[PDB]
Structure 1
Amino acid sequence: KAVTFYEDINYGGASVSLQPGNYTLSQLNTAKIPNDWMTSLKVPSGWTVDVYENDNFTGTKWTYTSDTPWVGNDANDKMTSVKIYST
């Protein structure tokens, strides 16, 4: 299992899956995830996803613990860095 980030609302468009870890903007890009692009994501039960508005896990932080068809108006297309936990 893994966290899957999607380009469009309700899990539409391009997608990219990631294992637990702390990913910076550069690392997201390498994994084929553009900046200000994430709109929805699926999260395994028991996992936690901290999406940060700025690089290096700073700026506003939005947390998700279950499938999310829409991250929210403020959080939409703002993920620049992200921490993923299997806890």
Structure 2
Amino acid sequence: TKAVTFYEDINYGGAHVHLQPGNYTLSQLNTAKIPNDWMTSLKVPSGWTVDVYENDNFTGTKWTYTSDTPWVGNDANDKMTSVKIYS
């Protein structure tokens, strides 16, 4: 099973969580054990797209990742509140 992996810390450190494609609100992230304001790095399967949103329900600033990322950027860091994952 291919999945996006979200990591708590820089360079894929700390706690991590795997998620299949989908559109996850903040509550859904928390249910899958991803707290708010937590994600710092992520791995993305080849050909996939991850749209990280600053606020809930897929709003606010949107950062897009299409490959493995040891650091999501200073603005994006610990700001993920909702996210859309595409294969």
TM-score, normalised on structure 2? 0.99
CA distance in 2, matches of 1:11, 1:67: 10
Deviation at 1:22, TM superposition (A): 0.1
Q: Deviations over 1:12-46 (max 9, x none)?
A: 00000000000000000000000000000000000
Moved over 3 A (4+): none
CA distance in 1, matches of 2:59, 2:13: 27
Deviation at 1:58, TM superposition (A): 0.1
CA distance in 2, matches of 1:21, 1:34: 17
Q: Deviations over 1:34-81 (max 9, x none)?
A: 000000000000000000000000000000000000000000000000
CA RMSD of aligned residues (A): 0.2
CA distance in 2, matches of 1:65, 1:20: 13
Structure 1 residues 8-87: aligned runs within 5 Å:
8-86=9-87
TM-score, normalised on structure 1? 0.99
Unaligned runs of 5+ in 1: none
Q: Identity of aligned pairs, percent?
A: 98
